[PDB]
Design a binder for this molecule. Structure first.
Ligand code: ADP
Ligand code: ADP
Ligand code: MG
Ligand code: MG
Lengths: 56, 371, 56, 371
């Protein structure tokens, strides 16, 4: 009985940890996507600048 | 010869020879005189059962801890505990072994001086050294920087260290610890009908706290959930039957750590005294302290505390810094493992307070260069 | 005994899964660090071009 | 063999072998003893971190520059800096290499004599020569005339030269430089709430000054614009988060150069001491000096100074003369590049102060023919 209780507690702890880790990794992926979006926006602005500089 | 790494603590005395992985003998530090009369003759009844023997005869004893909050309030009982630890749990006479006690930060001087005087006069050790309980816990993690929160059973203290240089002006010692959580749990259990009063039943409430309580990730959501469903009610069997069911007392007992207003204490929780301890440090070592926050001590073993504390500090701290909380699985014995490592070092071998030095300067030698 | 074996197996799998998730989040955090370095460098270069052009 | 072109400076020590384009090792000249106690044993903690090592552990050090204003105020620390420069940043023993130090104009004699005595007795070089920091900056520009304004970090001096003949009566040395600008910036930042006090945070204020400040073309118009719009407020992230926003402190910090009344100094700005230095020269070489005004030194790297200075001098000077300001992109290392060129010359190879000459006349040899 003692061993079973220990195992059950370990399982609950690990499950909660996996839930937190999944949420955190999803949030960080969202943040990376946002920063990539900003980089792409300024890169397209610079590409337009280069297109005009082709006439420069 | 080998050194004895004793660690008085408050609630569990942990001892063992230097150079191992785990303490050899771990037993509660309680000394309980019998309280009833006693009618059987020749039963061999002693006058005081100490250590783990008094956790089996606790039904007819009055257990009383000799260490209240780090400080030692009853020197005769503490001497008895030390004598038991040396002679019966390790069976090594102290005349042939150096000792390395541990002491909380910001403790009264007289306590430390009396400790060294006892160790040198009564037990007559060759040499003893007293070390701050947080530096050892930093040793055990294998780091050299970081701010360690050592929430023991007597007192919770938070010592920041950088590159080996401790910052004496940033130590925040708070007297909420495991014992106050036990008392608060014993006080809120009365809301369901279970009354524990005797000093022996405090041990039962401590067992309940250890086996069932956990720290909630978000307090209000848990309070709302436990008040609607019944998926939290976990039952527990007393030492005589009559199982009890703990409802939302599960995460309300250890919540006192983050809201010390529950037990009437004014100060801020362990989530905000760490941030305050960091902010007192210099502006250039705050990133390293943020990234190397260390947990230690017994009371930091609640399931789910390493996430609640990280969430709280991330809320307080600036958004750019990375907050990382080191929570090794061997948290309880972290201080003693660090003590073993420190005692096993060759560079440390000349820092002991040799007996001839004590004979020349008296017990006040401990405050001197040999710290 | 059978129930103990089952619970121990599920807890061990949970531990392995949380280890995998922690490694994955480490990888993605490192990738985000690299992209943050990229944005820092590109903004620094744009500022350098700005100061060179304003200062001839 | 090859010569060592060291350049003590005040704020950044620049060194390297003669005949290259850039100094081999450039690192701040600060020596910082630790100030806290230190609890980790065996961490290998040294007693003084010098050079670029103390810019990484600056959180627990007390950095102190050994050179105040050109002159050297702490000879032991300067000796330590030189020893580090020779042995760890270049890894060439000085017993086999001539050295070419540099010195500001109008400095105390004892400083120069002690410098040569150290170089000949402690490090035991074969031969050393001391050169004025402005002639080298004129070498690097490839000119042979011109008036050079070498606004370093310690002291700003303005040496006019014509056809290779220096004019000793027209050197105007002013003690406002980069360090005073750092202190003034640190003093005006307090008007928004940011307080930097520790000697370690002076480095942070220096970084703010380097990365954000610029010299305004017209001061009153900028003061009026910054007080109405908000197109100037540039933000900056401290070493721990908590970004700060610098408003009209951006162009008010380096404006002190042209109005030394801001920090209470009486003298006229760098825009008017150049004109005064020119007017002390003879009437027939003023056109050439007007046309070949040279900028050097670190502090002349502010974005937009080569236009403000030209506008000011054109306002002061007669309307017919052409005012041209030479501002090479390699301004910071201009003195060292010139030093390398001078040390690489064949005609210069017999001007070194050979050791036997020092043995015969003592340290006072430097003031003699071997200048
Ligand atoms: N597994 C656990 N879960 C929750 N609390 C615990 C656990 N183990 C110990 N504790 C609490 O920690 C205390 C022991 O702390 P400890 O680290 O031994 O104190 P000390 O610093 O005096 O040695 C006990 O009183 C108990 O209340
Ligand atoms: N890019 C920069 N922009 C503005 N100021 C600078 C810049 N680089 C250096 N400085 C200032 O110049 C100083 C360095 O001057 P330096 O020429 O190294 O002095 P020295 O003549 O002693 O070598 C620094 O203290 C800094 O305040
Ligand atoms: Mg402890
Ligand atoms: Mg210079």
């Amino acid at each position: 009985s003692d061993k079973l209780k220990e195992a059950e507690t370990r399982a609950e702890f690990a499950e909660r940890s996996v839930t937190k880790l999944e949420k955190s990794i999803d949030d960080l992926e969202d943040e990376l996507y946002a920063q990539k979006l900003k980089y792409k926006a300024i890169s397209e602005e610079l590409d337009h600048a280069l297109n005009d500089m082709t006439s420069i | 010869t080998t050194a004895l790494v004793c660690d008085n603590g408050s609630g569990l005395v942990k001892a063992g020879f230097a150079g191992d992985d785990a303490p050899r003998a771990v037993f509660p530090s309680i000394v309980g005189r019998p309280r009833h009369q006693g009618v059987m003759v020749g039963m061999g009844q002693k006058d005081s059962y100490v250590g783990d023997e008094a956790q089996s005869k606790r039904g007819i004893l009055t257990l009383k801890y000799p260490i209240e909050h780090g400080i030692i309030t009853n020197w005769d009982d503490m001497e008895k505990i030390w004598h038991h630890t040396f002679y019966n749990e390790l069976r090594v006479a102290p005349e042939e072994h150096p000792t390395l006690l541990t002491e909380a930060p910001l403790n009264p001087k007289a306590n430390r001086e009396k400790m060294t005087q006892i160790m040198f006069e009564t037990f007559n050790v060759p040499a003893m050294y007293v070390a701050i309980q947080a530096v050892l816990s930093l040793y055990a993690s294998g780091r050299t920087t970081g701010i360690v929160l050592d929430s023991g059973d007597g007192v919770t203290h938070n010592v920041p260290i950088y590159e080996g240089y401790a910052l004496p002006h940033a130590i925040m010692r708070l007297d909420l610890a495991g014992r106050d959580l036990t008392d608060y749990l014993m006080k809120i259990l009365t809301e369901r009908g279970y009354s524990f009063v005797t000093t022996a039943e405090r041990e039962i409430v401590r067992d309940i706290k250890e086996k069932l309580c956990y720290v909630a990730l978000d307090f209000e959501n848990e309070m709302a959930t436990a008040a609607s469903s019944s998926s939290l009610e976990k039952s527990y069997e007393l030492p005589d039957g009559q199982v009890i069911t703990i409802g939302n007392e599960r995460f309300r007992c250890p919540e006192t750590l983050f809201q010390p207003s529950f037990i009437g204490m004014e100060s801020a929780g362990i989530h905000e005294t760490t941030y305050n301890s960091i902010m007192k440090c210099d502006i250039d070592i705050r990133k390293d302290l943020y990234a190397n926050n260390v947990l230690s001590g017994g009371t930091t073993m609640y399931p789910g505390i390493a996430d609640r504390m990280q969430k709280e500090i991330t809320a307080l701290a600036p958004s750019t810094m990375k907050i990382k909380i080191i929570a090794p699985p061997e948290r309880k014995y972290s201080v003693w493992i660090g003590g073993s490592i420190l005692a096993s070092l060759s560079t440390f071998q000349q820092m002991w307070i040799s007996k001839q030095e004590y004979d020349e300067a008296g017990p006040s030698i401990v405050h001197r260069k040999c710290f």
